[PDB]
Nucleic acid binder design. Structure first.
Lengths: 49, 49, 48
DNA sequence: ACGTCCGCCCGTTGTTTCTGTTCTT
DNA sequence: AAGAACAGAAACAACGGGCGGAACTATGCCGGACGT
RNA sequence: UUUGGCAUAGUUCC
C-alpha cells in the first residue's frame, strides 16, 4: 500500500459506474448528475483544461 | 497528501514551491443551475496573463 | 556575534556572522533586493 | 512530559570608445 | 617633422520601476521530529 | 459585547 488516489465520479472506478437510474435514486444520487468531478474534503472539484 | 492538496487548493505543484505553481486548476464546482454545472464541466483556459 | 567576539573565533566565523546579520537587517528594511536569499519564515511565504 | 535542532517602455549609471590640447624631441 | 599623457563628449549595454476604479461571495491554510 | 490574518477562484458594475 503506497497511498490513496482520488476517484472521479461516474468514472470506470467509481461505485456509480454502470448503475441504473433506480439504483442511483436508491443511493440518493441524481440520475441527471453528469459526473466528472472529484470530492475533496467534502467539496466538489473540477479540473480545467 | 500531495494529490489531496493539489486538488484542494488548485496550486498545481508541491506545497513548498507554490510560488511558480500555476493556480487556477481544480476550481470548486458551480451548482447554481444545471446549465452552470454543465458549462463548468466543459471549460478551457489559456494561461496567458 | 557578541558571544563569538567575546570567546574568540576563527577569523571567518565572525565575518560570516556579520554578513548574516547584515542580510537580516537589510531584509527587515526591504525584502525585494535583486539577487538575495529572500528570507521566509514558514510555509514558504516571504515576509513583509 | 517537556524542550532542542533544522510582457513592454524608458529614465539612470557603467563601460568603452573616439577625437582635441599641450608639452617635449 | 614625431610622440605621449590627459581630458571632454558620445554609442552601446545593463538595471530598475512602472503599469483602474469600486463592490460581493466562496475555499484552503497558518512547520516538522524526536526520547530522555 | 465582543473582533484572527494570508493566498486563490468566481461574479456584479462602468
Amino acid at each position: 500500500f503506497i497511498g490513496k488516489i482520488p476517484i472521479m465520479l461516474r468514472s470506470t472506478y467509481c461505485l456509480l459506474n454502470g448503475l441504473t437510474d433506480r439504483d442511483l435514486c436508491e443511493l440518493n444520487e441524481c440520475p441527471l448528475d453528469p459526473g466528472g468531478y472529484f470530492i475533496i474534503n467534502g467539496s466538489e472539484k473540477v479540473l480545467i483544461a | 497528501d500531495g494529490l489531496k492538496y493539489s486538488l484542494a487548493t488548485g496550486n498545481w505543484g508541491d506545497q513548498k514551491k507554490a510560488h511558480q505553481a500555476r493556480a487556477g486548476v481544480s476550481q470548486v464546482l458551480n451548482r447554481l443551475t444545471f446549465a452552470s454545472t454543465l458549462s463548468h464541466l466543459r471549460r478551457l483556459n489559456s494561461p496567458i496573463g | 556575534l557578541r558571544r563569538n567576539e567575546q570567546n574568540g573565533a576563527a577569523a571567518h566565523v565572525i565575518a560570516e556572522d556579520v554578513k548574516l546579520l547584515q542580510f537580516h537587517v537589510a531584509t527587515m528594511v526591504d525584502n525585494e533586493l535583486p539577487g538575495l536569499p529572500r528570507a521566509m519564515q514558514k510555509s514558504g511565504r516571504p515576509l513583509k
